[PDB]
From a paper:
Human mitochondrial gene expression relies on the specific recognition and aminoacylation of mitochondrial tRNAs (mtRNAs) by nuclear-encoded mitochondrial aminoacyl-tRNA synthetases (mt-aaRSs). Here, we present cryo-EM structures of the human mitochondrial seryl-tRNA synthetase (mSerRS) in complex with mtRNASer(GCU). The mtRNASer(GCU) is highly degenerated, having lost the entire D-arm, tertiary core, and stable L-shaped fold that define canonical tRNAs. Instead, mtRNASer(GCU) evolved unique structural innovations, including a radically altered T-arm topology that serves as critical identity determinant in an unusual shape-selective readout mechanism by mSerRS.
To understand the molecular basis for tRNA-recognition in human mitochondria, we first determined the high-resolution crystal structure of human mSerRS bound to 5’-O-[N-(L-seryl)sulfamoyl] adenosine (SerSA), a non-hydrolysable analog of the seryl-adenylate intermediate. Appended to each catalytic domain is an N-terminal domain, which forms a long coiled-coil ‘helical arm’ of two antiparallel α-helices that protrudes away from the synthetase core. Both active sites are occupied by a SerSA molecule, bound similar to previously described SerRS structures.
Residue numbers in the entry:
A (entry chain A): 39 to 125, 128 to 334, 338 to 506
B (entry chain B): 39 to 124, 129 to 335, 339 to 506
Write the structure that this text describes.
Amino acid sequence: RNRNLLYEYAREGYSALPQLDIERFCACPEEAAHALELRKGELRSADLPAIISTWQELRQLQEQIRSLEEEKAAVTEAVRALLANQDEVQQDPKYQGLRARGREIRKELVHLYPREAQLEEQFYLQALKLPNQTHPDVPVGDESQARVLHMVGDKPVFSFQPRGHLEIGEKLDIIRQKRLSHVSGHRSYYLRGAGALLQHGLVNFTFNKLLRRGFTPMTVPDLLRGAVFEGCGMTPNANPSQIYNIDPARFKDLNLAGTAEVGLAGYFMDHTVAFRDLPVRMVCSSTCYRAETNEPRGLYRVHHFTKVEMFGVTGPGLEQSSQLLEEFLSLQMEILTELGLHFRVLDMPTQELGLPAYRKFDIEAWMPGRGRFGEVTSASNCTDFQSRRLHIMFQTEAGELQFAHTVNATACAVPRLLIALLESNQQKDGSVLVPPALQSYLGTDRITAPTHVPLQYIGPNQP
Amino acid sequence: RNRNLLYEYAREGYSALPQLDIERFCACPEEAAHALELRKGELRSADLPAIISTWQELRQLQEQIRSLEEEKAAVTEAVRALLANQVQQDPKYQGLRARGREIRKELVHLYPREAQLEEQFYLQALKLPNQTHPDVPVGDESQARVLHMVGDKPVFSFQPRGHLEIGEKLDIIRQKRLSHVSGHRSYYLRGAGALLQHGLVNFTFNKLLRRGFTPMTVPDLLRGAVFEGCGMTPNANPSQIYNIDPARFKDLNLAGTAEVGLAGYFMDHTVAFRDLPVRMVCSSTCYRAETNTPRGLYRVHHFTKVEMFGVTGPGLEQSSQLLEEFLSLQMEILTELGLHFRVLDMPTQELGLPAYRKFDIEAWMPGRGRFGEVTSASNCTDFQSRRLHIMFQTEAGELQFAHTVNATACAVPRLLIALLESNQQKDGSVLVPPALQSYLGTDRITAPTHVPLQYIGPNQP
Ligand SMILES: Nc1ncnc2c1ncn2[C@@H]1O[C@H](COS(=O)(=O)NC(=O)[C@@H](N)CO)[C@@H](O)[C@H]1O
Ligand SMILES: Nc1ncnc2c1ncn2[C@@H]1O[C@H](COS(=O)(=O)NC(=O)[C@@H](N)CO)[C@@H](O)[C@H]1O
């Protein structure tokens, strides 16, 4: 049921126990409670007091067990000398008393050991839900409180009232989201011709730009075990799960990934990277699956999406980690400006930061048909939260293994970008202007009506 | 559950009942039984007569159902006629009403028996295979026929070394300590290996686009019936189809080819004659369970594959020409990568349920020391069209069942193995084939600047 896979991995010896910075949080209790409330996370300040109590009791049981073991191991050596040194083997009641002391402590330990396991499991489960710290400049509050740091571009001015992405696509037969209920499901999309080329072009353009800027290219397994998701700070256990799961009966611990952050993290799990290699910048393109059951219609929310992701393992300094975030943001902003898109960079507030994020920058791009700015990219400094759980480490020249910092950002979310590109570059005739960067991949300056005859329904449902 | 989703679609009224070629089986039961046996599929000669018998019981029961129904209408009309001419008093009137009640009760009992027979005939019928080209060889994979052999085995001063060793040395592939992270037969490709996959897909896609293939993007999560339509069995006990938790989500299954999605696009929809032949190219992340049906990238659960699919004109020759066109494109791609490959006509046992003809290409992989399948090309004829209602409209306007052909343009895992093993060098470097040089950016893959990751884990003692 509600079991931390990471603790279970420690239990079977698969992985070590997650390390936590609980002592620092305990050192300032009033400050700690205030921080959590700002997060408005599942564990708000109300759930906090019980964890402190669980932690305190756990320490004591260990103390007792430690003392008992020292006494228990000691007596055996002492008796060994007595039988040989006495040279009437068991007559001295001291010999008799010593055996008795061992048995009573052994009995006490046999009772004590199960209680230690139950408590260790309990404290870790509550700790697993403990949120990351918040950067001082982070705006505090709901999405509305989020700050707008930089705005680039001007809203496209249209003579006509602009049409929506799906309408333009279906008219050009480049997007199909219709008659797909009994084949692929609700919110499922097929991209045809230019739409497919547009995705391929956007992914290839972003991949090439990042590869040139020193990103190391990688391919990630798309089916991954749940412990990794918990390590990335994603919640596999929760009821409104966005994570699709392979049938447990058929296969165990296999969960589809909604990003490549999870996969890239898996590569670094339980492994160390040399300080000299750091910083580590990596780029991956993956098919991403997210349930998102939690109601609009269109490509804005969909179950399957192809996304190019930027990930990095950075050095010890929190300041060193923050630099990567700004670099990632700069690149994110550059790709969008190069695509001719109007966008605004928002420092995210505590309520939207999420459990693993010290600071998050999200970029909203103007979509004319929606008439709204919508997240097209997310950038987050996860600091050591992910490193501590999955054991991503950096080894210094000295030989020391120390926890590393993880930064994650989105280069290309094909679904939303198509909406921005199609709606913004729309023309009254219904033609869409291929932005200059992608013109090479697409092969044209305008997406024009197709030569082909579109599919027509031959099903019984037609009325 | 154990239901054939296709029948349920008809039951729920979502789609029409699958049409089928069982009539040919009934016409020549002996000939069909010999053909079914040569296939060695789920069904067997002995199974066919029961299917033939089940058809007889169903059709006869339906004919009786119509006969009684005709009578019930006759009585109602005669009763209405008596009512117009004029009541309960009339002696025959009461008789007619009672006869009507009797026919109604008899129909009510007969109705369910027909439905049970329909499901039984259909579920066994859908396990019935497509026909085979006469040229198709008969027997196991041992009895394959080699249509063509291109290239020559690479010459090596050193003993050839395997892809996994070459990969780990250059840190382009990882299959180590992934058990608690992604599973066995799971792999991570890094640097040049990622570039090689990106290049192979982009190279293959580009050639196809230039030859006029239409680009497509297929939803990875698909409902089960489409798999059944393509001739794949999700209900099988040793299923190679990964299923999302049924309790959590309904009928969402992962795809092992894009064949399924592309078929869905054409399902229960019609194409115009002018468009034919319709050629589409898709790139898909393909997932396959493969429950023992050893290591390395030869058999893996996640793979990237570019698939050529086409819906052709009415003639079988129209389908066959596309198959040869598809193999031709496949052979060219392999050659342009400087690979030694053999084209094999697959025998009946290996054809598969929806296959009229299958041509597969095996490539020379030196470290293994054996040839290996990299491509499958097949003509499914009308088997898929009949099941998923993929149809074309003639100039007059008749809607008729189409023919579908499927072929693997590029399968990244096995091809990476051969290019790496075949183009290997003693220094441990691997030479980038000229076509892929632009994408990789180098003529040879050499040792990496970075330091390989080191396990900090507990399992080490
Ligand atoms: N259900 C969805 N439908 C469409 N696009 C989505 C969906 N979920 C996420 N995305 C896209 O993915 C972008 C980033 O996703 S995110 O979850 O916010 N953040 C991440 O994924 C980070 N792990 C880095 O990629 C969103 O801006 C949006 O562009
Ligand atoms: N488990 C696997 N591991 C690695 N490669 C695989 C695996 N399954 C299939 N492939 C690759 O995909 C190619 C085609 O596979 S196939 O099942 O024969 N044919 C199909 O996939 C058809 N659906 C057409 O694509 C194989 O030759 C091989 O190159």
